Amino acid sequence: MKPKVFITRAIPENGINMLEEEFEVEVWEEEREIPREKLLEKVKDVDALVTMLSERIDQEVFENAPRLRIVANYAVGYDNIDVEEATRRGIYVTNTPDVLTNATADHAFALLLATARHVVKGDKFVRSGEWKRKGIAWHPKWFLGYELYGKTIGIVGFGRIGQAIARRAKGFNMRILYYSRTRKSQAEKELGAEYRPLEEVLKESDFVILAVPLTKETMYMINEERLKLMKPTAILVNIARGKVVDTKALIKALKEGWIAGAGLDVFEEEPYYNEELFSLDNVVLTPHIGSATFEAREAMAELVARNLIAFKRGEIPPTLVNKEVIKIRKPGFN
Amino acid sequence: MKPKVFITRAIPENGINMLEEEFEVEVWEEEREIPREKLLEKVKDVDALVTMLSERIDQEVFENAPRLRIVANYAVGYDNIDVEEATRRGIYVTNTPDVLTNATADHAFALLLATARHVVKGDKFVRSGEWKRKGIAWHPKWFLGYELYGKTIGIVGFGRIGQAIARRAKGFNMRILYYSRTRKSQAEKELGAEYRPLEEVLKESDFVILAVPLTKETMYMINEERLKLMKPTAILVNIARGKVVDTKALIKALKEGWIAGAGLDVFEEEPYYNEELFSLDNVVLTPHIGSATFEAREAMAELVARNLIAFKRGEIPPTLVNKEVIKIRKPGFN
Ligand SMILES: NC(=O)c1ccc[n+]([C@@H]2O[C@H](COP(=O)([O-])OP(=O)(O)OC[C@H]3O[C@@H](n4cnc5c(N)ncnc54)[C@H](OP(=O)(O)O)[C@@H]3O)[C@@H](O)[C@H]2O)c1
Ligand SMILES: NC(=O)c1ccc[n+]([C@@H]2O[C@H](COP(=O)([O-])OP(=O)(O)OC[C@H]3O[C@@H](n4cnc5c(N)ncnc54)[C@H](OP(=O)(O)O)[C@@H]3O)[C@@H](O)[C@H]2O)c1
């Protein structure tokens, strides 16, 4: 008698418990991701879905889900969902902005600093015993990295996470440039940031941070010609999506010294293995953990629940991504 | 006819070249550190020394250096120099403050973030191919770390580097507490920082950063009872000196979950190997590279040269650490 939601992953219990008050809830509890054929089977009679970036919510899913009215992504990105087709069908799509902004902006800085200061390579040198075995405490030319103070940070995608990365950069006294679809004077005045065309941001920055969604417009925007514009001392950080960067071109740039290093949280396929990329000591790698804090987790689970419960009550969900759907079908289950 | 300086390491050429205009210069150029017996031989007829933290400038060095009038440490720390004995003897001692503040404060944040967000462990997971081999792109419970935003940072040693770490923490919207020998209202008002007794800082902080010199008073100040006061979710960062922390107690704290993790740039002996410490995935380790930026390097070399040249000219050196020596012997060579 309650509407039915399938949750494709073991998200925090707080969100599951909130949903159990208002829905019949099914939760995929396994460590492994749900196989595609099982996803298609399980959506047969669901009114709602909570999905991860690992599930491709495309036309084929919709065709196999005739009761589905709302998809809540447990993520701020939604490049895994065919939102135009959802809108067509009157299906509401929600995401999780804001509650993971600080985690991801912190992780961008974690990657920036780790890459700039040789933290991963340094740790291996110590931890392996090589430092002790070689017998040399310190040398003035070892492990030299790059300053941030007074340097220019270039933020590609000046949204929630991009602005939060700029806020952190102000603590390092950085000159802040950004490229975005829009220009925002509030954030400009609060942070001292300045808009420039993309190729100017790439030419003038000491650190380039990617914080855009994946769309047709941002696919491979960091390509071979764009990388050639960057400084040979510059560090690239990708916390956005893997396919914003042409990895083949990035490998060439790193090997040939077109840029100095890269910190990457996201990859063209996940999981990822690339022997050539992974052989480089001027890259730092993390497995798509930008939003991985206990608190962001929990807050994302609450927010997915709030969206689905608002929808049940005939309210517009607070983090609806496809507002055009409202005029197509009003909220609620039938 | 020019005074003679021995430089114990291959510091940047800019500083060497400045000194060659005014001194007969000898530079130890080898990768390895100068052996103790060679140090004692080489100081026999020097008027000045430029030393690294690796050289122990103690009474025995002074007794073997009868012309020595000034020691310029290529470091801000000077726990490797017996400054009281230098003063006694009329020997000026200088260091390198300021020019390495931003490098070291950046590295403190590099270690804080790497430890809080599992950057080293994450990189090994990806780079080794384990992420790919296990076949799972992402899991909501994997690699969960700690937020900074709104959290409390406790700075032990509120000097040049400690205040610069607080400046960076303001970009993360942190509540800033500090313990120091003094209280500083300027920095309090600029950064919103508040003084507290040491044990209160340890109890109330989510991140504890050590930025004190090594002195009799700070030796093993982070001991077993102090570690027990910390939060089980708290992260410790040591960019100060290894002997500020009782490593045996720190290992117990990390294994027993008294604190959540530690980022360490400095060790009780350097180089260092500790199999038990190095087996822990909740530690991040770097080989005393806090000041290792190209620019800090260069600026340290210039500053050592400026000190020795000012002294030659009968001027008080700009970063003299033992001001009492001035009344003992005026500056210059004879
Ligand atoms: N690595 C991780 O763990 C992780 C975690 C969270 C998010 N992410 C990813 O980061 C992305 C951004 O997150 P967010 O919350 O900051 O989203 P957001 O607030 O929508 O910000 C994205 C910004 O990118 C701008 N943008 C979009 N298309 C662009 C284009 N073609 N050219 C230039 N700028 C463009 C957007 O412009 P407009 O102002 O015109 O909107 C917006 O300012 C998500 O979409 C996601 O892919 C990754
Ligand atoms: N890891 C690295 O690569 C690296 C690089 C640079 C420096 N260091 C180390 O970091 C240390 C600090 O550097 P810095 O330039 O910030 O020096 P600093 O300006 O002298 O600051 C040190 C601060 O520690 C405070 N302090 C000293 N003794 C204390 C005590 N017993 N209790 C509480 N606070 C005490 C000092 O108090 P007062 O205000 O009363 O002076 C001062 O505020 C150096 O001495 C060095 O050991 C490490």
Author numbering:
A (entry chain A), B (entry chain A): 1 to 334
Extract from the study:
For the first time, the determination of the PfuGRHPR structure reveals a ternary complex in the presence of glyoxylate. Indeed, the electron density showed unambiguously a smaller substrate compared to D-glycerate and was assigned to a glyoxylate molecule with full occupancy. Glyoxylate is located and oriented as D-glycerate in PyaGRHPR structure. Nonetheless, the absence of a hydroxymethyl moiety in the glyoxylate molecule (compared to D-glycerate) reduces the number of interaction between glyoxylate and the protein and induces shorter interactions distances. Two water molecules, separated by 2.69 Å, replace the single water molecule observed with D-glycerate. Unexpectedly, the catalytic Arg241, which is supposed to orient the substrate molecule, is present in two conformations in the presence of glyoxylate. Additionally, the presence of glyoxylate led to the observation of a shift out the active site by 1.20 Å of Trp138, through a global movement of the protein main chain. A second glyoxylate molecule could be perfectly assigned to the observed electron density and was successfully refined with 50% occupancy. Detailed analysis of substrate interactions in the PfuGRHPR structure described in this paper shows the existence of a tunnel that controls the substrate trafficking. In particular, this tunnel is surrounded by Leu53, Trp138 and Arg241 and is large enough to accommodate a substrate molecule as illustrated by the presence of an additional glyoxylate molecule close to Trp138, providing a view of the substrate pathway.
Glyoxylate is a small and very reactive dicarboxylic acid molecule synthesized by most eukaryotes and prokaryotes. Considered as a toxic intermediate, this compound is metabolized by an unusual enzyme assigned to the D-2-hydroxy-acid dehydrogenase superfamily, glyoxylate reductase/hydroxypyruvate reductase (GRHPR). First, GRHPR is a dual activity enzyme. It catalyzes the reduction of glyoxylate into glycolate, which is either excreted or reconverted into glyoxylate (futile cycle) and the conversion of hydroxypyruvate into D-glycerate, a precursor supplying in the gluconeogenic pathway carbon.
